[PDB]
Amino acid sequence: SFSGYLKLTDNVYIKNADIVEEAKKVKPTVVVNAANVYLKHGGGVAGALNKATNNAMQVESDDYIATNGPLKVGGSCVLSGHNLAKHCLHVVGPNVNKGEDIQLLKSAYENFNQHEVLLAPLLSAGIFGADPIHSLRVCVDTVRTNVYLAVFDKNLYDKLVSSFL
Numbered sequence: 001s002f003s004g005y006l007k008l009t010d011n012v013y014i015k016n017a018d019i020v021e022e023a024k025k026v027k028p029t030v031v032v033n034a035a036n037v038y039l040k041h042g043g044g045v046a047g048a049l050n051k052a053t054n055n056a057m058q059v060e061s062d063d064y065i066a067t068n069g070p071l072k073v074g075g076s077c078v079l080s081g082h083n084l085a086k087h088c089l090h091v092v093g094p095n096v097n098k099g100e101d102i103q104l105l106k107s108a109y110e111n112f113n114q115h116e117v118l119l120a121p122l123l124s125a126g127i128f129g130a131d132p133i134h135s136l137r138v139c140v141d142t143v144r145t146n147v148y149l150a151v152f153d154k155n156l157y158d159k160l161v162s163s164f165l
């Protein structure tokens with residue numbers, strides 16, 4: 001199971017870890033991807049998870065988009081977890097670097113409530129441009145299921161834990 005996590009609340013846990021290495025170790029039922037509406041996994045967490053699947057995540061995602069069209073910002077879809085997890089929950093948080101509504105971050109986290117346990121990154125953090133402290137607050141105040149957050153950056157992990165209210 002998940003090991004080395006710091007408990008923040010009844011259901012939210014956090015660890016300074018690479019989510020790809022964490023997924024390969026745990027093989028969780030659900031790994032969350034920090035997706036965009038087109039499921040184009042170029043960089044950030046998405047680029048890293050896709051590279052770990054040898055691009056199989058991108059091939060599956062292109063077929064999904066060809067059939068269904070783009071996701072909504074704040075929305076999600078369940079696809080295969082490939083070699084990382086049973087499933088990948090592709091969740092689109094708002095990208096503030098694309099001028100998207102930060103208010104959609106709560107809607108994005110609501111997708112996590114459809115899964116009893118998830119391994120996830122902080123939505124809209126990193127290259128999505130939102131304040132990770134704000135993302136963690138929205139996570140704890142929105143997600144009711146068991147979420148194990150992997151924060152890649154050690155300095156950011158320390159700042160998140162030390163400032164957690």
Ligand SMILES: Cc1ccncc1CO
Pocket residue numbers: 018019020021043044045048049152
């Ligand atoms: C977690 C992560 C995010 C972006 N790039 C690389 C990594 C490591 O796999």
